[PDB]
Paper text:
Here, we report the discovery of a series of macrolides called sequanamycins with outstanding in vitro and in vivo activity against Mycobacterium tuberculosis (Mtb). Sequanamycins are bacterial ribosome inhibitors that interact with the ribosome in a similar manner to classic macrolides like erythromycin and clarithromycin, but with binding characteristics that allow them to overcome the inherent macrolide resistance of Mtb. Members of the sequanamycin family bind in the same pocket of the ribosome as erythromycin. Like other macrolides, the sequanamycins bind in a narrow part of the peptide exit tunnel at a site that lies between the peptidyl transferase center and a constriction in the tunnel that occludes the lumen, near ribosomal proteins L4 and L22.
Further optimization of the carbamate moiety at C8 resulted in SEQ-9 (IC50 = 0.065 μM), which demonstrated desirable absorption, distribution, metabolism, and elimination (ADME) properties. The cryo-EM structure shows density for a methyl group on the N6 position of A2058; however, there was no extra density indicating methylation for A2057 or A2059.25 In addition to the extra density, there was a significant movement of SEQ-9 away from A2058 in the methylated ribosome as compared with the unmethylated ribosome. The distance from the N6 of A2058 to the 3′-hydroxyl oxygen of SEQ-9 is 2.9 Å in the unmethylated ribosome and 3.7 Å in the methylated ribosome. The distance from the N1 of A2059 to the oxygen linking the ketoallose group to the C5 position of the lactone ring shifts from 3.4 Å in the unmethylated ribosome to 4.5 Å in the methylated ribosome. Moreover, the additional hydrogen bond in SEQ-977, formed between the NH of the sulfonylamide from the carbamate group at C8 and N1 of A2062, is not observed here: A2062 lines up along the wall of the tunnel in an analogous manner to the SEQ-569 structure. However, the weak electron density of the C13 and C8 side chains in the cryo-EM density map of the Mtb ribosome-SEQ-9 complex suggests that these side chains may be quite flexible and interact with the peptide tunnel wall through non-specific interactions. Indeed, methylation by erm37 is induced by sequanamycin treatment, consistent with other macrolides, but it does not affect the inhibition by sequanamycin, as they show equal inhibitory activity against the native and methylated Mtb ribosome.
Author numbering: 2 to 273
The structure:
RNA sequence: GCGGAGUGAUCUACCCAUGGCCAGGGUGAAGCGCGGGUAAGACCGCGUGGAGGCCCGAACCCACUUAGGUUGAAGACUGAG
RNA sequence: GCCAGGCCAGUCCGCCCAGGGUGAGUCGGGACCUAAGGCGAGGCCGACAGGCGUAGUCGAUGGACAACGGGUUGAUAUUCCCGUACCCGUGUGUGGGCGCCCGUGACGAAUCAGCGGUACUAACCACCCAAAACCGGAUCGAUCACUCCCCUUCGGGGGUGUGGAGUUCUGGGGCUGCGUGGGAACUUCGCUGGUAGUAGUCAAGCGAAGGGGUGACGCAGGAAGGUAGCCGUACCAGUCAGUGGUAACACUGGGGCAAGCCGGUAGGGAGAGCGAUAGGCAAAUCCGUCGCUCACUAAUCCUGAGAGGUGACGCAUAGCCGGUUGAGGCGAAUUCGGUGAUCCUCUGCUGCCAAGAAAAGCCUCUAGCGAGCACACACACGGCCCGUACCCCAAACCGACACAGGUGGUCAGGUAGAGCAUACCAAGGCGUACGAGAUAACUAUGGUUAAGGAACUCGGCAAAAUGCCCCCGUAACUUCGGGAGAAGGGGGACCGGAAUAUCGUGAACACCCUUGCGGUGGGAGCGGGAUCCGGUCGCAGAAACCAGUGAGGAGCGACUGUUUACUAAAAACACAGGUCCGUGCGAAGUCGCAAGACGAUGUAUACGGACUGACGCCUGCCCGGUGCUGGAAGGUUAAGAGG
RNA sequence: AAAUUCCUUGUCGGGUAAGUUCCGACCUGCACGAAUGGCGUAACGACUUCUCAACUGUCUCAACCAUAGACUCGGCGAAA
RNA sequence: UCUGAUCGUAUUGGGCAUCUAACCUCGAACCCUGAAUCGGGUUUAGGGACAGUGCCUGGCGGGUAGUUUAACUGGGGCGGU
RNA sequence: CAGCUUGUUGGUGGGGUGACGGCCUACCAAGGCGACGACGGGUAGCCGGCCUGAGAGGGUGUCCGGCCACACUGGGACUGA
RNA sequence: ACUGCAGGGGAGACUGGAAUUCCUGGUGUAGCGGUGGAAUGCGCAGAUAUCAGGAGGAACACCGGUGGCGAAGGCGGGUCUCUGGGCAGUAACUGACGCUGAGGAGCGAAAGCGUGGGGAGCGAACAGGAUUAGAUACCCUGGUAGUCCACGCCGUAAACGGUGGGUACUAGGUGUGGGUUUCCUUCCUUGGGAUCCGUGCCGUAGCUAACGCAUUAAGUACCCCGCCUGGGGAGUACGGCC
RNA sequence: UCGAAGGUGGGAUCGGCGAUUGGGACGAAGUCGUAACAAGGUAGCCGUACCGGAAGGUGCGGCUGGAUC
């Protein structure tokens, strides 16, 4: 699962890395790859809108099939499990019996060579994609969509899962990875099972260089700035900031969710 | 110093795309084998292997100390480290 | 040319004057392609100004694409000329081949009659229920009438037995139906004869829209096989350098040549047919997927550095003659080894995680077009636009200067050396622009120093010292990796012998066979390193240049890194790790009036903010204040309503 | 008794011939204290600080040599 | 009958519920469209008189802006006046 | 005190001894010792004997006798049976 | 070896009910909780109580015992999969292949440690109330780690039968468990008798200072291992291993 | 060549002193509490964790070397 480096250097002393034991076919599928380029956290104006971005290893995008709507009743065979630099889960390449190749998020327990079904008549097995109406309550699902046909949007990171609490009339109550209970329409599609690569959260990056490779740039604390730069700046020695904690633009801590967002009627219980 | 409207990222700060460069030595990680060990092991020793914000050190990038310069060769440099 | 300029002078000049000089189908670009990014028809947004952006169109620092050697001018040359190549296009002939119609072959339906799928289902058969209505059983309680019985103010209970419209369970045909299962004819579909081998389709060639494949990609590390270059050498042509020796292999010089074409080596890679087909915006014989057979260690095919041939009867060259010292003319030998890449095979191979452009181009499929086509040879032609002079670690560029500064890429020889360090040299350049003198102090840059050895000083600042290779040996502590080159020691030159395979590198003459760019033995010639023993010299053998000082105790920051261009490099910043808070998704946050964008082609193991800052042990008490989160009983409180 | 301690060269011990610095304690903390983290910590440092070996013109205490200037002659010829 | 408690036609506003048709959707499909992740239109699936916006109005608001922050004084500050 | 040894273990050919022998030397093998305690630390002359104890045993090595080791400390050769 | 027998022996996976708590809604108003007595605390902004639905973790009443199993520690909600051991019977097979075991190795309650998850209830630490001269406690109200899961670490308990393992022998009486066996075999009795393996109690001899042991010995003998030489200091110091 | 003595160096082992500091034993007729021996007033012990002037207290698991129906 996780391989620990040996303390041969100070940079490697405590670090660890995935063993990549689940990976076959170390190259991607040429027909499902699109170009990508970095932004450095800059928007269309050319200005930094997200801080601490840039550098980073070059990447290529792999088209993930997040809809899974048009292959109902058509079986697929899992051909490979591949590394993806754009997400924390691994991806599985599917060979459809119709001759088409697709990429999906690899669920937990979807070894190469398995058969994957879709539609209302599919069996309840990891990797099978069904509308929520046909999934029994208490199941663990992932890659759920908010609107019918809108594409999977929830529970997509490594190790994520959603528990189908129940379907009442035309809505399904879901326990979402944050712990918030939500309702979505029963016609929304979901995939059975939990997302794989669940142990990646235990990886110990060893040095600053590794995060620079992953594209994360250094972050400077507010209390070591000058007051013209940050509200926490100033002071003779080191201070705690001369006030209650605030953002670099002076906003205090507290809830930032819009108080009367339209979706409030779909949320049963806020997270802890 | 204040206001209005414009000009500047050929210097410099960061970022994006596409290219180039890093003499010569040293150390010897994982993994892979063989043998020892056992019921199996764990482990151990020999090889192979060639990792690393690894070591010494030119090009290259810097600028710690000191001497000189200080109407300078130079509006920030030279010599030795 | 010499009155300005050149840090002096100048007959000289990067200065002044006149004239001359830059030749491309292949070099670098355009006419080809796209990245980041720019502009942007319509468009969306915005009082106006304008912002953003789709189709599209630009934009190399990248992709694709055809040339090498020699000569020549005062000044250009892969451009001109000579020799020899390659790429794209056009015309003219010649030859055979396939096609239009003819027919050639092949493939190739449709009509209508015989039965079932009993699929349709009027009905019919079975399975449960309303099991309808109704006959009618047991129980219930305070209604009800009946007859038997009893107190009472004359109004009703009770033993309730019967049943009434009575509650519930249920005894019985469940006729009518519901739901399901079998299920009547034509009707949906199939077979046999039949329309009929008929209609009809395909069979030269081109397909550039569109589909598909390729193009197409990271970093690190070698190894093997090669080659360039370099060092010798067979052979060739010469020299006598006025010194003691040296007359020929003693010494000096030579000991060359490309693209292209042929070739298919070492090394690499590849299963082949047939059938089906929901997918690839239409189609597809293409791609993808699936099934079957055969094949698998082979064979075949592709790729492929090198070797060899040709290019080359040519060019070049050491040298020799004559030479206004310009041009001329002649012109030898050219073999075999060693060493050896930063280059080639190799867009390969191995390993790793941080997971590594696009489009054109090329190939292929069909849509489509199509009566003429495709090919071979020969001849004759067309190949456009811009750059090309000269400087280019500089006196010609950026620094006001002919300024000790700065400036990307390519080539890069010998001896010693690990080396692109360092010392001296080659090829090739240069002596660079004020000089000539003179033992003043003093300043600067170097050098040496008796005895002492940090006594100097804020402080060992500066200088001195250590320094290489090989062999021994190596502490506390430790996160077990380190500390460590710890510390501290020993040896090092030359000559000879071992020593003729001593050893190790490659492998000539000469040894077999599937005869080749083949295999084995073989050991010549040529290079390399180490050790032991004996001897020799010096003050000194790492010889010059070059080239770690080491140890012990504390503080701070874990570490590599970053920082005040021009007085501060640190204990400051960052960091991996930690906790808290926010964010349920065109999220929170940020830019923007807005549209829109980034976040992210991400989805709570994610993203943003704050503080702390490897690791180890831990992180105590306080919610009074102020923030944040949540609640709404009460008080207070705006516009509006009311008037 | 600290990058925090004014008094202050606090007191005791070590080191030195002689130690306001250094190291180990004491606790009388002017004015330490647990993520503006507390206490340690192998490795690392052109960081700050103390000691030792070796070495030396840093010094006792200076002396000599060469070069570039300074000095003389010819030419050009500024500046505050 | 200050009629507290109260009924039925008017009228009205406040809550709650439902609906769809205004309005909303970066849900989907098709056309403009030959090349289109823009835009617009058509249909559909949802939300829905909410939200958003205009005008009026209360709160909060070092996020930004313009400013103020006296004099005397055996120098100024401290104190005092 | 849990790992000790490299002339150390053995063999070969010489040298050396009065005499066998790594005793010494040149070459070859990788062996030899160790939990029945090597290697290391502390202590000590051994025995016949002496004392005590019914005995087994416990203590001790002085008179005397036997031997060993030493001659200021450390090292070496010669004469000689 | 073959045939039967009993079992909470162990591991994994799925799953069930009761109860507590919490959430939502209905009914509903002024108390609830707590003690020897109270107060802190909770509710009045709608609590306790009652109903219905949902969420979640822990533990499995009745069976259940004096019982069974396991080397010890320990072991029962149910089902399935995998697996260990024991007992009985035949004597089918080998033929002393046995016992103990220095060191060594493995297993090993609870508490605790590392990493991730989980957390209903309880509950060190901590806080408030109460008692008391004081109350850093006993009592009450709360409440963190922990108790739970996964993989590791730790190897300590009054880890006790305060009794090392193996074998042979030494009256009986009375319960229970698993077998087998003829007979009384219907005396239905699943009783009695015989044997083997256990598990309790009482009791003969013997042993013991006594208490007591007594076929499950602390009796009579043998073999092997471990341990003690008065009490503190001390199972502590130093050294060493983990 | 070997070879006593001597010098240089890093280590190994055994002791002595040491500012300061921890625990132990004994002393007197001190101060602060009553933890155990009774159900010792909250039963006592065993292993661990945490806390507090101190004896000790609390939690987890085990024993009776106590009692109860
Ligand atoms: Mg812009
Ligand atoms: Mg950030
Ligand atoms: Mg930071
Ligand atoms: Mg600052
Ligand atoms: Mg700024
Ligand atoms: Mg501010
Ligand atoms: Mg500050
Ligand atoms: Mg401060
Ligand atoms: Mg803070
Ligand atoms: Mg501040
Ligand atoms: Mg201005
Ligand atoms: Mg501009
Ligand atoms: Mg290197
Ligand atoms: Mg290895
Ligand atoms: Mg490095
Ligand atoms: Mg810098
Ligand atoms: Mg200076
Ligand atoms: Mg000067
Ligand atoms: Mg300098
Ligand atoms: Mg320098
Ligand atoms: Mg002139
Ligand atoms: Mg002049
Ligand atoms: Mg634009
Ligand atoms: Mg326009
Ligand atoms: Mg563009
Ligand atoms: Mg262009
Ligand atoms: Mg280019
Ligand atoms: Mg020229
Ligand atoms: Mg030509
Ligand atoms: Mg690609
Ligand atoms: Mg090679
Ligand atoms: Mg001569
Ligand atoms: Mg020669
Ligand atoms: Mg195919
Ligand atoms: Mg050739
Ligand atoms: Mg030119
Ligand atoms: Mg030129
Ligand atoms: Mg140029
Ligand atoms: Mg210039
Ligand atoms: Mg210059
Ligand atoms: Mg440069
Ligand atoms: Mg060279
Ligand atoms: Mg050089
Ligand atoms: Mg020279
Ligand atoms: Mg001169
Ligand atoms: Mg003079
Ligand atoms: Mg001297
Ligand atoms: Mg001297
Ligand atoms: Mg000194
Ligand atoms: Mg001094
Ligand atoms: Mg002095
Ligand atoms: Mg110095
Ligand atoms: Mg020096
Ligand atoms: Mg050394
Ligand atoms: Mg050290
Ligand atoms: Mg000599
Ligand atoms: Mg060095
Ligand atoms: Mg300290
Ligand atoms: Mg640092
Ligand atoms: Mg620290
Ligand atoms: Mg500076
Ligand atoms: Mg500086
Ligand atoms: Mg620095
Ligand atoms: Mg900084
Ligand atoms: Mg937003
Ligand atoms: Mg969070
Ligand atoms: Mg905070
Ligand atoms: Mg900090
Ligand atoms: Mg951080
Ligand atoms: Mg507070
Ligand atoms: Mg507060
Ligand atoms: Mg409060
Ligand atoms: Mg509030
Ligand atoms: Mg102090
Ligand atoms: Mg202080
Ligand atoms: Mg002091
Ligand atoms: Mg000093
Ligand atoms: Mg001190
Ligand atoms: Mg705190
Ligand atoms: Mg502080
Ligand atoms: Mg704090
Ligand atoms: Mg800190
Ligand atoms: Mg500290
Ligand atoms: Mg550094
Ligand atoms: Mg530093
Ligand atoms: Mg100090
Ligand atoms: Mg003069
Ligand atoms: Mg509205
Ligand atoms: Mg404000
Ligand atoms: Mg202001
Ligand atoms: Mg003003
Ligand atoms: Mg005043
Ligand atoms: Mg005054
Ligand atoms: Mg020998
Ligand atoms: Mg011998
Ligand atoms: Mg003695
Ligand atoms: Mg006796
Ligand atoms: Mg002696
Ligand atoms: Mg004497
Ligand atoms: Mg002697
Ligand atoms: Mg004699
Ligand atoms: Mg003799
Ligand atoms: Mg488990
Ligand atoms: Mg809860
Ligand atoms: Mg309620
Ligand atoms: Mg309730
Ligand atoms: Mg037999
Ligand atoms: Mg045993
Ligand atoms: Mg044992
Ligand atoms: Mg436990
Ligand atoms: Mg734990
Ligand atoms: Mg945890
Ligand atoms: Mg309290
Ligand atoms: Mg309690
Ligand atoms: Mg509680
Ligand atoms: Mg803890
Ligand atoms: Mg264990
Ligand atoms: Mg027990
Ligand atoms: Mg015994
Ligand atoms: Mg026994
Ligand atoms: Mg026994
Ligand atoms: Mg019995
Ligand atoms: Mg008894
Ligand atoms: Mg006894
Ligand atoms: Mg102990
Ligand atoms: Mg110890
Ligand atoms: Mg003392
Ligand atoms: Mg007591
Ligand atoms: Mg007690
Ligand atoms: Mg009491
Ligand atoms: Mg008690
Ligand atoms: Mg307590
Ligand atoms: Mg306890
Ligand atoms: Mg207990």
């Amino acid at each position: 699962a996780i391989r620990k480096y040996k303390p041969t250097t100070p940079g490697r002393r405590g670090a660890s890395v995935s063993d990549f034991a689940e990976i076959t076919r170390s190259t991607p599928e040429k027909s499902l790859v699109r170009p990508l380029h970095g932004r450095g956290g800059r928007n269309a104006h050319g200005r930094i809108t997200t801080r601490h971005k840039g550098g980073g290893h070059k990447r290529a995008y792999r088209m993930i099939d997040f809809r899974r709507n048009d292959k109902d009743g058509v079986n697929a065979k899992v051909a490979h499990i591949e590394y993806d630099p754009n997400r924390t889960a691994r991806i599985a390449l599917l060979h459809y019996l119709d001759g088409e190749k697709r990429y999906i998020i690899a669920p937990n327990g979807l070894s190469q060579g398995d058969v994957v079904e879709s539609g209302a008549n599919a069996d309840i097995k990891p990797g099978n994609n069904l509308p929520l109406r046909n999934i029994p309550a208490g199941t663990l699902i992932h890659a759920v969509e908010l609107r019918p046909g809108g594409g999977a949007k929830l529970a997509r990171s490594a190790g994520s899962s959603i528990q189908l609490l129940g379907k009442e009339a035309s809505y399904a109550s879901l326990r979402m990875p944050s712990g918030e209970i939500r309702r979505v329409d029963v016609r929304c599609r979901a995939t059975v099972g939990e997302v794989g690569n669940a142990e990646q959260a235990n990886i110990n990056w060893g040095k600053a260089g590794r995060m620079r490779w992953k594209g994360k740039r250094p972050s400077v604390r507010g209390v070591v700035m000058n007051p013209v730069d940050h509200p926490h700046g100033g002071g003779e020695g080191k201070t705690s900031g001369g006030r209650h904690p605030v953002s670099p633009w002076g906003k205090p801590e507290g809830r930032t969710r819009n108080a009367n967002k339209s979706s409030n009627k779909f949320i049963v219980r806020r997270r802890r």
